[PDB]
Amino acid sequence: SGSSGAAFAKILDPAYQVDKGGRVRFVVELADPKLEVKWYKNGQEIRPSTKYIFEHKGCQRILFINNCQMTDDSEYYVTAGDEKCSTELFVR
Amino acid sequence: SGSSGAAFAKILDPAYQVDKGGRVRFVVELADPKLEVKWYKNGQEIRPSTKYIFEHKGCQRILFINNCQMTDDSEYYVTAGDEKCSTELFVR
């Protein structure tokens, strides 16, 4: 059963919004504080840069997207273990 | 912006569980009571059968999976408009 593979103590909200030029913060909580996660934008892996800042605080895994523009208006997902959850970012 | 495409008033819960031989009920709520939805099991469209019963009550879109077995332990998603949400079903 997929039950033995549960990895998310807290998943992403269904959707988030942000004003143009603003910053959005995505947060998920893992059961295992040592488990690694990967973030994706519309299916392509996101990596640390000036647009994307990643933080790891114990069980929390955070992704900040800076200077949000319409190019950032998209679906995003994060993987942990054999699971994944997604969200939609709406840029105003 | 994807904001003008929002179609889910209520999305699926992150995960559901069910006992072997039991029945599970998935429910989502659309903003538009006339909008059609499609359900998928691990990426393949689910159709009305004895295993799958679909109900439409105003804005609510429901899917019942009967006689759940380990074969039903899987990821599922539903689409509405240009959006989709997913969930995991754990069979005990």
What does the DSSP assignment read for A52-83?
A: EEEEEETTEEEEEE-S--GGG-EEEEEEETTE
Q: Are A65 and A72 in contact (CB under 8 A)?
A: yes
Q: Name A78's bridge partners.
A: A39, A85
Question: What are the phi and psi torsion angles at A85 (to 5°)?
Answer: -135, 155
Q: What resolution in Å is listed for this PDB structure?
A: 1.5
Please, which residues 24-63 of chain B have a Cβ atom closer than 8 Å to chain A? none
- Identify the helix (H) or strand (E) that includes residue B88: strand B83-91
Q: What is the set of domains in chain B, with CATH numbers?
A: 1-92 (2.60.40.10)
Determine the distance in angstroms separating the CA of B85 from the nearest CA of chain A, rounded to an integer: 8
Written as six digits, the tokens of B66 are: 């009967």
Q: Which of A57, A91, A73, A78 is nearest to A13 (CA)?
A: A78
Q: Could you give the angle at the alpha carbon of A75 between the alpha carbons of B86 and A48, nearest 5°?
A: 120
Question: What are the phi and psi torsion angles at B83 (to 5°)?
Answer: -115, 170
Q: How was this one solved?
A: X-ray
Determine the distance in angstroms separating the CA of A73 from the nearest CA of chain B, rounded to an integer: 6
Q: Are B90 and A3 in contact (CB under 8 A)?
A: yes
